Amino acid sequence: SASRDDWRAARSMHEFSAKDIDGHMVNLDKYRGFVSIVTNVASQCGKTEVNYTQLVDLHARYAERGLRILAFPSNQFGKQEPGSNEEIKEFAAGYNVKFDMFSKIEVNGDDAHPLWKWMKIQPKGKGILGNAIKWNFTKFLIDKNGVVVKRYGPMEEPLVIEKDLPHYF
Amino acid sequence: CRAWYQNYCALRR
Numbered sequence: 001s002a003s004r005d006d007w008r009a010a011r012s013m014h015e016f017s018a019k020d021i022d023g024h025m026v027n028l029d030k031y032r033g034f035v036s037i038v039t040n041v042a043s044q045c046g047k048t049e050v051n052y053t054q055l056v057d058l059h060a061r062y063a064e065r066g067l068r069i070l071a072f073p074s075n076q077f078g079k080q081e082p083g084s085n086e087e088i089k090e091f092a093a094g095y096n097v098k099f100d101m102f103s104k105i106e107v108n109g110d111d112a113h114p115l116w117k118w119m120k121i122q123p124k125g126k127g128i129l130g131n132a133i134k135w136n137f138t139k140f141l142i143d144k145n146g147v148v149v150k151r152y153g154p155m156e157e158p159l160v161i162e163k164d165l166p167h168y169f
Numbered sequence: 170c171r172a173w174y175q176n177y178c179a180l181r182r
Contacts, residue, residue, distance in 0.1 A: 007172040007180055017179050025177050105174075114172035114179045 007114035012146030042080035054158035069099035122148035
């Protein structure tokens with residue numbers, strides 16, 4: 001509010017950019033034409049295993065249809081992502097991740113990545129008790145035009161997204 | 170740039 005918030009006027013996830021887990025700046029317009037799941041991850045949560053395994057399942061099954069997964073580590077929830085980006089990359093490799101890992105970010109507060117600020121105010125990005133990210137492994141499903149079409153909370157295992165994603169290919 | 174994050178432009182014109 002006192003901060004610059006021209007991010008509010010973006011019309012698509014595809015307008016944004018973010019550093020990948022190796023520190024390289026990626027323009028998210030590469031996802032034009034691809035159904036995407038954007039999620040915040042952490043390594044030291046009780047549901048880390050179920051989330052990583054099922055995200056890998058989704059990518060393995062649907063990458064050929066155009067499914068992409070953008071995983072943003074964050075240490076904002078119980079300090080459950082204390083590692084460096086290199087350590088997080090290695091952790092993801094242990095789950096045979098082949099989707100897109102990003103550098104660690106904040107997802108809540110004034111210093112959150114602006115993509116996350118933007119997703120949280122979208123009509124289909126609404127949370128329950130306000131729009132803040134509540135814990136690790138929130139998921140946003142994004143259509144081929146970069147519009148948010150659904151939000152899933154931490155406790156919704158990634159395979160629940162499988163019911164919805166085929167409508168957007 | 171419409172939104173900076175750390176040392177890069179997170180939302181280009």
